[PDB]
Each structure stands twice: as C-alpha cells, then as structure tokens.
Design an enzyme around this catalytic site. Structure first.
Site, PDB file in Angstrom:
ATOM      1  N   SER A  26      61.347  17.488  16.928  1.00 20.22           N
ATOM      2  CA  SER A  26      61.961  17.565  15.665  1.00 20.22           C
ATOM      3  C   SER A  26      61.783  18.896  15.070  1.00 20.22           C
ATOM      4  O   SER A  26      61.077  19.806  15.435  1.00 20.22           O
ATOM      5  CB  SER A  26      61.062  16.618  14.792  1.00 20.22           C
ATOM      6  OG  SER A  26      61.391  15.161  14.677  1.00 20.22           O
ATOM      7  N   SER A 104      58.669  15.049  22.053  1.00 16.31           N
ATOM      8  CA  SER A 104      58.229  14.474  20.744  1.00 16.31           C
ATOM      9  C   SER A 104      59.434  13.369  20.515  1.00 16.31           C
ATOM     10  O   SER A 104      59.583  12.380  21.185  1.00 16.31           O
ATOM     11  CB  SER A 104      58.421  15.530  19.858  1.00 16.31           C
ATOM     12  OG  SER A 104      57.726  15.322  18.413  1.00 16.31           O
ATOM     13  N   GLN A 105      60.264  13.648  19.210  1.00 20.44           N
ATOM     14  CA  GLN A 105      61.188  12.636  19.023  1.00 20.44           C
ATOM     15  C   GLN A 105      62.263  12.753  20.297  1.00 20.44           C
ATOM     16  O   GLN A 105      62.753  11.627  20.751  1.00 20.44           O
ATOM     17  CB  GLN A 105      62.072  13.170  17.812  1.00 20.44           C
ATOM     18  CG  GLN A 105      63.068  12.248  17.347  1.00 20.44           C
ATOM     19  CD  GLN A 105      63.715  12.616  16.043  1.00 20.44           C
ATOM     20  OE1 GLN A 105      65.069  11.881  15.833  1.00 20.44           O
ATOM     21  NE2 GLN A 105      63.084  13.128  15.029  1.00 20.44           N
ATOM     22  N   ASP A 159      46.522  14.623  20.422  1.00 22.83           N
ATOM     23  CA  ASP A 159      48.073  14.465  20.172  1.00 22.83           C
ATOM     24  C   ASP A 159      47.946  13.105  19.497  1.00 22.83           C
ATOM     25  O   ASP A 159      48.111  12.110  20.376  1.00 22.83           O
ATOM     26  CB  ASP A 159      49.123  14.713  21.161  1.00 22.83           C
ATOM     27  CG  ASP A 159      50.609  14.946  20.661  1.00 22.83           C
ATOM     28  OD1 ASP A 159      50.572  14.427  19.440  1.00 22.83           O
ATOM     29  OD2 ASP A 159      51.284  15.479  21.434  1.00 22.83           O
ATOM     30  N   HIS A 172      49.835  18.746  19.480  1.00 23.93           N
ATOM     31  CA  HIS A 172      51.355  18.329  19.584  1.00 23.93           C
ATOM     32  C   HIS A 172      51.947  19.527  20.021  1.00 23.93           C
ATOM     33  O   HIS A 172      53.179  19.469  20.481  1.00 23.93           O
ATOM     34  CB  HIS A 172      51.807  17.759  18.435  1.00 23.93           C
ATOM     35  CG  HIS A 172      53.176  17.118  18.730  1.00 23.93           C
ATOM     36  ND1 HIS A 172      53.659  16.281  19.656  1.00 23.93           N
ATOM     37  CD2 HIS A 172      54.305  17.202  17.962  1.00 23.93           C
ATOM     38  CE1 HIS A 172      54.707  15.808  19.350  1.00 23.93           C
ATOM     39  NE2 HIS A 172      55.328  16.346  18.294  1.00 23.93           N
TER      40      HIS A 172
END
Length: 197
Positions: A26, A104-105, A159, A172
């Site tokens: 993101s 992540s995303q 995370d 993260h």
C-alpha cells in the site's frame, strides 16, 4: 527501479526465459515499491538482463490502503489487473517459467490472482514469495490452489498483518534483508529446480 514494464515492453520474437510479476504494498511508488527493485537486481544477476523480464502490477492496481479491508484483501479491479498480466505472459511467451511475489496488499493480491488463475498458467509459476502477507492467518500460510513447496512466506514476529490484523507496526516495514537475500535465493532455486526455456 520502482517502475518496470519488461513484459509489456518486451518483444515476443525474443521472449526472456523467466518472467517475474511482482505486486507492491500500500501507497508505494512505481509499480515495484520498496522491495521489488532489490529482488529484481538479484534476478538479473542470476539470469542476465535478457534472461528475465521483471513486470510490476500497475494499471488499475492503485495500492490504496483502504482496500485491505475488502473481502479478498484488495479490489476486484486489482485482481483483474494481475490476472491479465499472467495471461499476457502466457500468450506472449509460452515457454517462459513464471515467478511471482507481493508485499502487504500485493501479497493478498498475489494470493487472490493465483487462486483464480487458470490451472494451466498457475502451474507455470514455479515459486511465489510473499512478504507481510495480510491473509497469512486466514489462509494458514498457503496460497489457495497452489502447492506449499512452491510458496515461501516472510512474516516477521510482531507484524500484526500476519496474525490476522490490519494494524501496520514497525516489523511490517522491515522486510529489506529478506528481499535482498532469502527471497531471490528461493525464486532462483525454484526456477532452476524446473529450469527456464
């Protein structure tokens, strides 16, 4: 890097042997973000510039933070964009071995895309690496319909996205070492276990 469109720019008459399709986290820039260029440099060292096409997922994938809350961890528009790039690899270069990654995303987008993919294209992806995988606990560390031996997940202690939350905490943001060593090593290894083109 941050932007690499080697599959979109690449000539069909001279397909590379390995095609890496990567999705960013993101809010990151280009279509590769913070982790993608480090994996890329290292893949180019192993196979040479003309041997590997690195392709980030751009187009409709916006990498909007809010989309982590959506059913599949990303928008449907974005699953369509990565799906279309796997289908372009497949048509432009059918003998190429594919590899994929996401952070992540981008890790939830990579898992959503690979789940929906046609079995014959999915089976060409010889290794997938996921960093800070937001659906790690929901999916139990697997990508649906994709073998565990071909998957490697990098999830830091602390995370919270690996543990079923969507809170962004400092671990993260600490995937840089992995993107520089373990993750290209796994991918290079999987491509060599089956071989290239």
């Amino acid at each position: 890097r941050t932007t690499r469109d080697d599959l979109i720019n690449g000539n069909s008459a001279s397909c590379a042997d390995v095609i890496f399709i990567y999705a960013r986290g993101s809010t990151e820039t280009g279509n590769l973000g913070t982790l993608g260029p480090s994996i890329a440099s290292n893949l180019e060292s192993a196979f040479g510039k003309d041997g590997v096409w690195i392709q980030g997922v751009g187009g409709a994938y916006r990498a909007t933070l809010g989309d982590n809350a959506l059913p599949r961890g990303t928008s449907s528009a974005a699953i369509r964009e990565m799906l279309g790039l796997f289908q372009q690899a497949n048509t432009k270069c059918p003998d190429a071995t594919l590899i994929a990654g996401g952070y992540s995303q981008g890790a939830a987008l990579a898992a959503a895309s690979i789940e929906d993919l046609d079995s014959a294209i999915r089976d060409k992806i010889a290794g997938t690496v996921l960093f800070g995988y937001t659906k790690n606990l929901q999916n139990r560390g697997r990508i649906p319909n994709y073998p565990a031996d071909r998957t490697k997940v990098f999830c830091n202690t602390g995370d919270l996205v690996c543990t079923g939350s969507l809170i962004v905490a400092a671990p993260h943001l600490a995937y840089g070492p992995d993107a520089r060593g373990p993750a290209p090593e796994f991918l290079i290894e999987k491509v060599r276990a089956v071989r290239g083109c």
